[PDB]
Each structure stands twice: as structure tokens, then as C-alpha cells.
Amino acid sequence: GSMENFQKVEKIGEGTYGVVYKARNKLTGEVVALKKIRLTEGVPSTAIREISLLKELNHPNIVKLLDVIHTENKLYLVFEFLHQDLKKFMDASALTGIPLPLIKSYLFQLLQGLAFCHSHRVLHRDLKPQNLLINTEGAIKLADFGLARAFGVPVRTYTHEVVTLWYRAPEILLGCKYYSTAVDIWSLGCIFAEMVTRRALFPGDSEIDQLFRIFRTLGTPDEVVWPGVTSMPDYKPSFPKWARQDFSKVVPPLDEDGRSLLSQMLHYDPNKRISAKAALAHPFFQDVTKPVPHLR
Amino acid sequence: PDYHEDIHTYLREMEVKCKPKVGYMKKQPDITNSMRAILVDWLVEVGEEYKLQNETLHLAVNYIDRFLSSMSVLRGKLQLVGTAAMLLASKFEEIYPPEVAEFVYITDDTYTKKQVLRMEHLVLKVLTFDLAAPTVNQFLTQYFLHQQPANCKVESLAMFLGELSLIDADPYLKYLPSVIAGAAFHLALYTVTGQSWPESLIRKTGYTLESLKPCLMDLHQTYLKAPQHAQQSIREKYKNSKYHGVSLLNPPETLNL
Ligand SMILES: Nc1ncnc2c1ncn2[C@@H]1O[C@H](COP(=O)(O)OP(=O)(O)OP(=O)(O)O)[C@@H](O)[C@H]1O
Ligand SMILES: [Mg+2]
Ligand SMILES: [Mg+2]
């Protein structure tokens, strides 16, 4: 694989260390995305991780890294092209919303992609609608592994940054020394909610705001709901103690099975929070199909 | 809890694919097991100076052996390969990797920044960016979950023994990480508590003391001879309280195997 064989079509994004282009393989006709990575500290650790981890993760619901074009001062990652991200799609569905069969199809596929990551000891750590890509056939795929990492069993302390604030799990917010796969499930719970309402479940502007928004929705956690919570580094006994509201009021359109699943993804205690693997079998998915998106 | 079985199974597949060639040293015209021992021992010291994870040390060693499985290297450039490997391992594994300038500094300025960086690129090319390799350390931490009850001296001693295995290509290059971890964990358990390889780990790994015996005989010898070995950085490092001073523990004279 080499750059002469690609004809660039248009810019489709700018991430970091480079621009992302839509391109066409002149010989095979294959349409791809080219992520450029500019090369004084050498190859960025984010790209080292993204490339090494993506090469291990071949799955229909994970963006496919096709090739790495590796030259002098330039690094090009060749990905399968996917037409749109979930955020753009939700905005396009502003007024009629997203049909339930599609929401359920996308959630089921996201859980499959995520269970495959976790089974291969990979934490994504930036699940959000902007990083989830959709095609015209009805597939949705995890993308942007620039913040991912290979974890060990059991985990040790990893980077305390991680996850864009709106999708960030309470155990990260409360500074637990150990976080694990459950952080990606929290993000997916936030995304499930968002697909249904088309607004962020917890749109905080700061870490403390984020925590309080979560507390106001799911109740302030005590030692009963989450043993160890009051000893966490960033727990403060002055935290207001909000009552947990009727869970049917969090995402009112959801019926019983959907509420059950959402509540399990948004469990405070990381140990009790549902795994992606276990969620695939939830009754919510009894009638899941895979229709194409209802919009161009 | 979930994924522990899946992950172990996956790592067992990957350690086979990520294994260096057992006979590569005999195909290196200019470098020896002795030179590689010197290099690994230095990397231990580097890890100490920068307070790097043991996992980072193990990954760097895996990168070096794989690199040297397909690339001939003169003795004057072996340290350049090792420095680049350690830089890559750090970028992969560390929350806060040392800056490149820091890596240039510990090579006593034998090499330039441009050299270190060009070698980083070469190593990524040779390894085809395949950096998420299983290590003795990764199997050890899984095995540690089967202690009854957990014992910090056991854990530290097992890490110490796994680390000693990194130094000597003969014989350890022929054993898979999961098997070295197995021998190391049993030997540690036996040294500290007199217990052995638990049946719960037979169920998990399929290894018995019979299947671990060859590596364990080797490891027992390395343990006994460790005070006399030309390379001493691991023993020195494991005197620290951080590792419960386990290098001060007496090896048993017999294993009963
Ligand atoms: N395979 C692809 N097909 C189509 N579009 C893509 C593809 N990969 C990336 N893009 C577009 O480029 C954007 C940025 O790329 P990506 O998220 O992979 O890296 P990033 O540096 O994290 O980006 P950002 O900094 O914007 O979050 C994506 O959100 C998406 O819109
Ligand atoms: Mg992104
Ligand atoms: Mg030789």
C-alpha cells in the first residue's frame, strides 16, 4: 500500500496531529478514510496505541484499519470509509427522532463491538456519538482509538484524565485509583439515553457540575448503593444528598425493558454495573433486527 | 470477573504469535547472549532511574528479541536498539513516559536524538506496529488472583524471578511467558509459604508441576546462582521495600520434583 494509489476526495474532519480525508483507491475503487499523523518527540504515544490496538481488533463493529503508510515525516492510517458519525445523524433526526428498531440495532451492535474490545483487554475510554461511525447498510462501529489502552488483569492505576466529561463515569470523577471496563459501559448508557432524547443525559461544564447532575438524576450514592463510595479520594461529606427519582422519568419514552437495561448500565458500583457481554442477552434485544438508517 | 477467561485465552494465543526466534543469537554475527544480558541489566537500571513499570521493562525486552530475530546488529548499535525499544515500551505502557531527551541522556550521549528517533521508526517498522505483546508480568498478575490468601512477598518474589529470566536468553528464550510465570509463581509460593502450584491454576492454564518442571529446574538454578551472576541490577532493585526486599530471601536448596 502507498499514497500514489489514492485520490483524495474531500476533507471530512480534523482530529489531531492531522487532518482526515475521504479518498478513493484508484485501482480497486475502494473508498477509504486517510488519517494523517504529522511527525520532535517522535511518533506520538496516542498513534502508537491507536495503531497497535486497532491491528488486534478485527470485528464488524470496530472501524477497520486497512493499512499504515509509513514514510519520512508523514504517517497515514488507511481506514474503511464510513459515511457519517452518530452525532451528525442525531442532529439530522432532530424532529422526528430515531426509530426504536434503529436505536436497538445500534445499541446491540455497540455492545458487540465493546464486548470484543474488553475480551481483548482493550479499554476505549472515549465513547461518545462523535466517535461512533455509521454506514448506509445499518452498521455502527466504534472508532477513534486514540485514547484507548491495553489493560491488565487485574488493572493497575491508569491515566486519570479520560472520557470526555459528559460521558465520564462517576468512579473517574471521584478519583478511584482503579477503573476498568465499566467506564466504557457508563459511556454507552449515556449514549443509549442520548439516542432516545437526542440530548446529552449529563451535560456538565465541570467535574463537580458533572457529578451533581448525575447525583440529581440517579440519587446521591451512599454506602448501601456503592460500598466504599464515602472513602473515595474526591468524595466530600458536604455533597448534597439528592433523592433518586423515579427511573421512568430519566428517559420517559423508554418502556420497561429499555429502562431495565439503562438502569443496569448506569449502576453506581462498577462491580454491579452490567458488562457488555451480559447486556447482549437483555430482554430489550429480544426483537432486534438491523435495518438501514431511515435517512440519507 | 467477566473477561478474565476470555483475556487469558487471548493472551495464550498471542504469546505464541509474539514469540521471538529461539535460535536468533547463533545467527547474529557480532552479538552474544552475554552482550544481551548486559543490555537487559542496563534497562533494569534505566527503569529504576525513571521509576518505570515492570510491564514496561518486559515489553521492551520482547521488542528487542523480536527485532533481533530478523535484523543483524553490530555491538556498537545494540544499545541504540534497546533505547528505542524502551522509549516505545514507555509510550505504550506509561502514564508519563520520560521525554526523548531523557533517553538520549542515559545512553551517556553515545547516540544522538536523531539516531534514537530514526531507530524508533525502524523498530516500529520491523515489528509492524505490533506492540501489545503478552509478558511474564501479565500472566503473573492473573496467577496472583489464585493465592489463598494474597501474600505480598509471594507476589514480589515471583516478579523478581520473572525478571531474572529476562537476562539470560539461554535458556529462557525457549519458554513462553505463561510457562515462565508458572514456574516463577510456584517457586515464589514454595519459597515463602511451602505451598505449591494450586489446582485452581491447573484448571485455568492446563499446566501442572510436571509440565512446568523443565522451566522450574532452570529457574531454581538461576535463583540459586543469582548472587554470583555477572549482572546484579535486578537483585539490587528487589532489595527495595517497594518489593518487600524479596531478593534478600534465601532460595530453597531442593524443590522435591
Ligand atoms: N473511517 C472513517 N470514515 C469516515 N469518517 C471518519 C473516519 N475516521 C474518522 N472520521 C472523521 O474524522 C473525525 C476525527 O477523527 P478521529 O475521531 O478518528 O480522531 P480524533 O483526533 O479523536 O478527532 P477529534 O479530535 O475531532 O475527536 C471523526 O469524528 C469522523 O467524523
Ligand atoms: Mg474523535
Ligand atoms: Mg552470535
Side-chain angles (χ1 to χ4, degrees), chain A residues 248-285:
Chain A
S248 62
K249 306 289 170 281
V250 181
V251 188
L254 247 35
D255 294 300
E256 190 171 69
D257 287 335
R259 289 196 308 266
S260 155
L261 177 58
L262 186 56
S263 66
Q264 290 178 251
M265 305 176 75
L266 296 180
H267 211 283
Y268 273 116
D269 186 342
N271 282 199
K272 298 272 206 62
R273 201 176 303 153
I274 199 151
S275 77
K277 197 201 273 188
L280 289 171
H282 199 276
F284 184 60
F285 300 116

Side-chain angles (χ1 to χ4, degrees), chain A residues 100-176:
Chain A
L100 180 59
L102 206 51
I103 288 172
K104 188 180 296 190
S105 168
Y106 284 172
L107 187 58
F108 193 66
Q109 292 180 69
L110 292 169
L111 293 162
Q112 282 179 58
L114 192 57
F116 191 93
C117 287
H118 295 167
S119 289
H120 289 69
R121 51 93 176 87
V122 171
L123 298 185
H124 183 284
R125 304 188 311 171
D126 206 29
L127 295 172
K128 57 173 176 184
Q130 298 87 343
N131 287 343
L132 304 176
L133 298 175
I134 61 163
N135 72 16
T136 50
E137 283 302 297
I140 188 158
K141 312 194 188 205
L142 308 204
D144 197 2
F145 282 73
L147 275 308
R149 86 132 82 207
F151 67 91
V153 169
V155 303
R156 60 168 210 266
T157 298
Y158 305 129
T159 306
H160 66 201
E161 282 164 301
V162 324
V163 198
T164 116
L165 188 60
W166 297 353
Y167 307 89
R168 186 176 308 168
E171 64 269 26
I172 303 163
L173 292 160
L174 293 163
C176 179

Side-chain angles (χ1 to χ4, degrees), chain A residues 10-80:
Chain A
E10 70 195 30
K11 176 186 186 203
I12 53 177
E14 290 177 350
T16 192
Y17 293 109
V19 190
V20 179
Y21 283 81
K22 179 193 196 191
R24 196 178 63 242
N25 186 310
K26 286 193 262 189
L27 292 171
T28 67
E30 179 179 35
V31 178
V32 300
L34 307 176
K35 189 160 166 179
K36 189 196 288 201
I37 299 166
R38 277 178 296 253
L39 298 165
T40 159
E41 204 78 19
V43 184
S45 73
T46 169
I48 272 155
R49 287 187 175 163
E50 185 180 343
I51 298 158
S52 62
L53 298 169
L54 250 8
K55 286 195 75 211
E56 282 193 33
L57 300 169
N58 284 76
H59 183 94
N61 299 118
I62 301 173
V63 72
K64 199 174 297 202
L65 180 62
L66 301 165
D67 205 357
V68 175
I69 299 165
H70 189 267
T71 83
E72 75 308 301
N73 308 341
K74 263 143 84 179
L75 195 50
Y76 282 106
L77 310 199
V78 190
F79 291 99
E80 62 173 317

Side-chain angles (χ1 to χ4, degrees), chain B:
Chain B
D2 287 45
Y3 313 114
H4 276 200
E5 187 186 73
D6 289 348
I7 293 169
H8 181 262
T9 292
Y10 180 61
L11 296 183
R12 286 282 301 265
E13 160 177 28
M14 297 315 285
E15 68 172 357
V16 172
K17 300 171 174 221
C18 296
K19 200 188 177 43
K21 313 285 170 300
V22 183
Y24 82 73
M25 201 59 79
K26 291 212 91 180
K27 285 189 163 86
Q28 292 278 349
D30 204 55
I31 66 181
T32 61
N33 290 318
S34 191
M35 290 176 192
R36 180 197 167 276
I38 284 164
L39 176 67
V40 179
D41 185 84
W42 179 70
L43 295 174
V44 178
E45 284 194 327
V46 170
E48 281 288 280
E49 179 58 26
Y50 291 99
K51 294 168 161 70
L52 304 173
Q53 294 296 311
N54 291 350
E55 179 62 11
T56 301
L57 195 213
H58 282 80
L59 285 173
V61 173
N62 166 278
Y63 304 164
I64 292 158
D65 287 333
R66 278 157 70 207
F67 186 92
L68 298 182
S69 291
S70 58
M71 308 286 287
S72 292
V73 185
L74 299 187
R75 64 190 69 196
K77 295 295 213 288
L78 185 61
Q79 193 181 201
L80 182 55
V81 178
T83 299
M86 199 61 160
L87 172 56
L88 284 171
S90 301
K91 288 188 179 168
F92 187 83
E93 194 58 34
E94 300 284 334
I95 300 165
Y96 305 104
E99 282 171 27
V100 177
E102 285 164 302
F103 286 99
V104 176
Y105 179 84
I106 37 93
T107 62
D108 314 82
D109 260 283
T110 331
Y111 309 112
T112 67
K113 196 176 194 174
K114 284 190 181 199
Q115 275 179 318
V116 172
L117 253 29
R118 287 171 111 159
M119 183 64 82
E120 173 184 78
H121 228 78
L122 189 60
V123 171
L124 288 163
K125 269 154 162 147
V126 166
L127 301 185
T128 51
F129 283 85
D130 293 317
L131 302 172
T135 60
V136 164
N137 181 74
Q138 288 178 51
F139 288 99
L140 280 175
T141 64
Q142 302 175 262
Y143 298 174
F144 291 171
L145 301 173
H146 291 248
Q147 300 167 90
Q148 172 56 30
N151 188 308
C152 292
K153 307 212 94 83
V154 169
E155 295 188 22
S156 286
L157 186 55
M159 284 184 285
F160 169 65
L161 299 163
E163 209 158 309
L164 287 176
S165 83
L166 292 182
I167 303 283
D168 301 307
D170 185 7
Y172 300 104
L173 221 40
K174 74 179 179 287
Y175 300 116
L176 288 162
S178 62
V179 169
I180 298 172
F185 182 58
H186 170 73
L187 185 49
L189 205 56
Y190 187 74
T191 305
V192 184
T193 73
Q195 320 172 102
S196 36
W197 184 255
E199 94 90 49
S200 68
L201 283 174
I202 303 168
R203 279 155 53 217
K204 183 187 181 66
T205 72
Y207 305 146
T208 59
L209 281 174
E210 187 182 329
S211 64
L212 295 174
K213 192 179 159 164
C215 184
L216 191 70
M217 296 313 278
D218 282 340
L219 207 60
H220 185 38
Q221 285 301 119
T222 295
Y223 193 10
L224 279 167
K225 290 215 93 167
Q228 281 84 217
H229 199 283
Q231 281 65 56
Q232 285 297 308
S233 297
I234 293 162
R235 278 189 74 239
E236 291 272 354
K237 157 183 179 181
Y238 282 83
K239 284 178 189 66
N240 196 264
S241 52
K242 186 190 191 300
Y243 310 101
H244 317 87
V246 292
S247 63
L248 309 173
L249 294 174
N250 291 141
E253 45 200 41
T254 58
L255 298 182
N256 314 106
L257 271 89

Side-chain angles (χ1 to χ4, degrees), chain A residues 285-296:
Chain A
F285 300 116
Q286 69 194 110
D287 55 352
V288 73
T289 44
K290 189 196 155 184
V292 301
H294 69 297
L295 301 164
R296 268 222 205 275

